[PDB]
Design a protein around this nucleic acid. Structure first.
Ligand SMILES: [Mg+2]
Ligand SMILES: [Mg+2]
Ligand SMILES: [Mg+2]
Length: 89
RNA sequence: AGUCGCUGGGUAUAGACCCGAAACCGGGCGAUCUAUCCAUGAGCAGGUUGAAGGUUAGGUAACACUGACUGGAGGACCGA
């Protein structure tokens, strides 16, 4: 929950599939990706924060699970999501 | 019966019959050899090996990590 409400409100509308959409995998993956990348700065300065890293790993596993489900449903939608977000490194 | 000479034998102090040390001390001369240093120059054919690093393709949540290409380290190797 390191993302502010403004940042959350910022990225939800760029990845929403329709008005009022906050549960679609694109919003979820984009929500996790922005939080994952933001936390990278914290873990650089705080390298002994093993307890907060457990939460970061969970966000990484959650994003992987969502992308794998999006793989089965619509591969074209999956492809656009990672290209826009720059995943699959 | 001493005393002063002269000559000779002996003695004392002197190198004291001649030659001969290892050494000791004083003043000088030497670092064109050599030992270390200082400054300023010069030399080291040829052939190997293949560190760190880099790039790239992967890979990682990120750091990592892997391959290839590269790179050219070393009181390193063979050898004038
Ligand atoms: Mg000389
Ligand atoms: Mg040598
Ligand atoms: Mg030799």
């Amino acid at each position: 929950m390191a993302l502010s409400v403004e940042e959350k409100a910022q990225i939800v509308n760029e990845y929403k599939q329709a008005e009022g959409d906050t549960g679609s995998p694109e919003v979820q993956v984009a929500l996790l990706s922005a939080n994952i990348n933001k936390l990278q700065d914290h873990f650089k300065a705080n390298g002994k924060d093993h307890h907060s890293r457990r939460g970061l790993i969970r966000m990484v596993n959650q994003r992987r699970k969502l992308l794998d489900y999006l793989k089965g449903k619509d591969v074209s939608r999956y492809t656009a999501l990672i290209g826009r977000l720059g995943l699959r490194r």
